[PDB]
Every structure is written in C-alpha cells, then in structure tokens.
Amino acid sequence: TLNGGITDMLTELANFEKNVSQAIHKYNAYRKAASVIAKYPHKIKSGAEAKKLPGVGTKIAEKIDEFLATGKLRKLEKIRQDDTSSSINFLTRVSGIGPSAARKFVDEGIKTLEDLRKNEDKLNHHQRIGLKYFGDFEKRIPREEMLQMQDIVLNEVKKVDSEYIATVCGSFRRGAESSGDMDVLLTHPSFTSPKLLHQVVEQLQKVHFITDTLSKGETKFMGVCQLPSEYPHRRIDIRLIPKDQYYCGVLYFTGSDIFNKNMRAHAFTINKYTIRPLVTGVAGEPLPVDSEKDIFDYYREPKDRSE
Template sequence: MNMRKPEMWTNCVYQEFPITFDDVAVYFSEEEWDSLEVNQRLLYVNVMLDNYNALLYLGCIHETPDVIVRMKLRQGPYNFLEHKELANYERNVNRAIHKYNAYRKAASVISKYPTKIKSGTEAKKLDGVGAKIAEKIDEFLATGKLRKLEKIRQDDTSSSINFLTRVSGIGPAAARKLVDEGIKNLEDLRSNEHKLNHHQKIGLKYFEDFEMRIPRSEMMQMQEIVLNDVNELDADFIATVCGSFRRGAESSGDMDILLTHPHFTSQTSKQGVCQLPSDGDKVFPFRRIDIRLIPKDQYFCGVLYFTGSDIFNKNMRGHALEQGFTLNEYTLRPLGVTGIAGEALPIDSEKDIFDYIQYKYREPKERSE
C-alpha cells in the first residue's frame, strides 16, 4: 500500500522522473474494503483522493482514472471533494465569495448526511443545497465526474492560480499577478524569489512540509510544549490552541494559538515555523504556527471565532443579528433601534456569548459545519 510521499511532488515539479497515479494510489479488494471500519475507510479514501488531487494540481494527469471514478461513486456522503474543489476555484480564480460559501456549505451538509445521497432532488431537501448544486450532484452520481471541474483542471491559468494559493502567504490576487507574469509553479517561484515577500519566501521554503497535515498526536505534543513554555514565561497568561484541532479533528493544517493576559491591553500577532525535537531517527516536518495576543475583554469572542468552523461562525453571526446583536472576533454588541451598535457586553466565557443571543451551547467538537 502506497501512502503519499511529499518528496515526490517536488520531483514531479522538477520533472526528475515521471510520476503516475499508480505511484500514490491505495488499492483494496472489495472484501478488504468491506472489512474496514468506517473511520479506516474515511482515512484511506481521503489519502487516495488527496494523492490524486495533488497530482492534478501539479499537472501530472488531466483525465480522471476509472479507479477514482469508482471510488467516488462508492464513496457516498463521506467527502464531497468536488464541491470543495469548485469552492476553491470560485474563491481563488473567479473571486466569487458567495459561490465559494455556497459550495462549502453544500459540501458540509452533504458530508454529514447519514445515508448515501441518491439524487439531486433528495439533496435539495438539505439546507444549503440549491437547484444548481443539485444538478451537479445528479451529474456526479451518474458519471463520477463534473464537466465544469474537468474543464477547470485542464485550464492552465486556473490550475496555476489554484496551485500558487497553496503556498503560504500567496493569496488569490497575488497568485493571479504571478501567473500573469508567467510564474506558475514551484520552479518558477524559486527562480523569481526576489518578487516574493518574507512570508511568501517562508511558504516556498517549507512548501513540502506545510502541505502535510499535522496528525493529532503531533498537535498534542506541540500543544504541551507551547503551554508549558507560556506558563513558565508568566503563569497569568491564558492560552488556547484553536482551529480544527480544538474541534477534535484528527489532523490540522497548522497550529493557531490565542493568548491573553490580564495586564496586557494591546493586540499583536506573530506567524512562524516550528518543529518538534527529533525522536531517535525520526525527524519531524516543519509546521506553521500562528500566535495572537488579544486583550482579555475580547479573548472569548476571539476563541469562538478562531475555533470555527467558518460556516458555524457565519451561522452564529446570523443568529446574533436576528436576536438584535452584532458579533465578530472582537466583541458582542447590542443593536439599538437605529441599527447602531452599543457598548461591548462583558464576556467571561464562550458560553456567555451563546447565552446572550439565546443560542444553544455547542461544544467545540460540534462546530465542524
């Protein structure tokens, strides 16, 4: 069984040797597949499709292999990657944030549906799935492909923009500017490093490491080190590791830490790179780490916001408005009759926010929408 080998992506970019789907695919017989636990199926489906998507981003294949088609058709509601990929296209290339949000929401509700979606009509009954997305679901269920996505994958400009945004520090606007200048891949970036800012240079330097998800076990080790160091620095600091890790995810893209201190009133943030100490012969990858220092009176709004998910946050803000409040990452404020926000309300916990807006409290692990 082959798992993803990050160094292979670099070799593919530099064309040091040809790489094919067979190099990274994960195969099972029907009997083996049926014998797996659900969480194991989720793991291997994601590995296989993630490998395939990585190859697509690097331009190694342009046709969907039959084995991937069969896997997607068999996959059911587990991970509607096509809609997530379309969402990224709308955000990074079209800059259509409303479509990006629509695809993300649809992918989220479909992934949580308890049984396999059998038609677009059935999917339309779910909150967040409209007529156009339902049509795409019918097409996907019938063929295992989406014509729009196949076309996007074969468009050099779209593929290049999507790929460059995977480099930490390069957003959609910067990616388009680079592509317009003929910079489309890692080799081009390394040849034009003088055009990158410090953040982007770091993203390029550690690209292969940053592409790898951080297993929860590694996140736990990093959290222990960080919290111990913070406590040794000053026991009055309060620190929370947020993001998907706090929501219970089995892997994370980076480590996002929020800090506060009763005697500090300023706000600042630092982005950096960290690496766990080697364990015998095992050398850990470099990881991204973001640290934000937030005033105490804004801390729990910040913890709520940076825990996410982004769709959960959007729903929470919408409910707050319905109840006569405005909520953001800093404060919760009541709205007056003229629509002008009043003074920030005192908040000493996340639950205070839920109570103010009369929203049933949800543990972090219940917020992955």
C-alpha cells in the first residue's frame, strides 16, 4: 500500500510480458521487483533508492523515475489502449486460455467473453469450464467456507476407506482468513514409492460436491466444487502421493512460496518428494520421513510460514 502505485505498475508490466510478449522470465523479474518493493517499509522517492533492492535494476529504476515525475508510464498507457494487446491479456484470465490460445483467438477476431460464448466449438473442455465459471474463479474463499469444504472432503474420504489420509494444505493450512482455492493431499498405506484417486473423486461427485473436471489422472485431479445450499463454484485439486513421500509433499504444498525457497536454501536438498543428503555433491538415498518435524530435525508451525 505504501508504494502501491509502483507495485501495480510493475504487476501490470509483468502480466503484459507473460500474456502478450510471452516472456516468462521478464514476467517473473517484474513480479520479483514488485514483491521486494511491496515489502519495503518506506515511501520510495527515487528509482536510485529502489535500485538498492535486490531484483530492481536499471530499467525498473528508470521506470520508477518516470512514474514518480509524471504519475504514469507512457508505454503502459499505450499498451492499455491497444485493442490487440489488452484483449490478449484479458482472455488469459480464463482458466485454460494461456498466451498461445489468447493470441490465436484474438488473431481471428475473438476478443471478449461474449465472443468466447459465441464460439464454444473452438474451446477445449478446460476452457469451456473456465468460461462457465469465469467470475466465480476470480472470487476468493472465506475461511468459514473452506472449513465447510474441509468437512465434506474429510468425511467423504473416510467413508470410501478409513485408512486414507487427507490433508488440506496451501494457505488454508497456514491459517489464512481467505483462500484462492482448495489444495488436498491424499495418501493410502497401499500406495508407496490401484485406483485410489478415482474412488475418492467419484464419491465426491456422488454427494454432488465436485461438479466439474478440468483434468484427471491416477495421481492428480483438478476440478470444480461447490458447497450445497447459492455458493460460488470453487477450484479444488487433489493429489495422490506415496505414503513414504507424504509429509515432504505436505510441507511443499503448504507454502508459502517464500518460506519454501528459504527453507531449502537454508538446507541437504529438499524437493516435493524427498529429502536427501549431499562429499562432492553426490546425492544419497532419500531419508526416512514420517512427519513434518523430521524435515526440521534434519520447527515452524504453518501459521508462521510466510517466510
């Protein structure tokens, strides 16, 4: 909020690079710069000042100078009024429509949500669902609803087989007051490093909790769910992970992104699967893990895992 003008500018630049220019690394550069500035506890008076922050270089410092002196960015104002670029950028807000699809659509005169509605045959299954729940997917989920959603998931999972273990991770596990989606990690003692995932998904569809499917395989389900009453439709992912790699998965999918990076950087090598020792760099076999604390013993409650 203290430098919201600058961070919004950088975020807008970020999106354009990712969505229109298809330059993912420049997207991430702008985001990294936006993040380090948003955490900066002073009102920025110059680009030179911001330049001192890691992730802010010459080009962004120059842009900040323009923004501070004029209250805007010339090229950013031009991009906003550009029909092609703004349409491409907007279409990517539809889940399933990335930079490639967005560009192709705009190339053939398809630029709006209404245009998408008139051209259903040109959309794949995922994109049709993204279109259908466009507004709902951009809503956040209050913790109270997440709790009700957790109630349903844990209940139905245990009814299928009481030996399943299910954990809602992500921001919810970190105790966030709101969440963007629901991330569920699933395991079963019969699965280590059968159709375990299918049976869970089917039961959730049976009680009319899961309403649509974006993608589904033996280890990962991505779909849509809805609380009964009208509640917005929500995004839910369910991952089946081997029992012996469960808690590494729980750690990884709990977050936050900043905490995860800082944890393995201050670590051994830690990925989503295992933790293995490193010698000349030759990684050994995975270490035995039966809890989150074991990783730390090689502690931070989820409540404080922002960094």
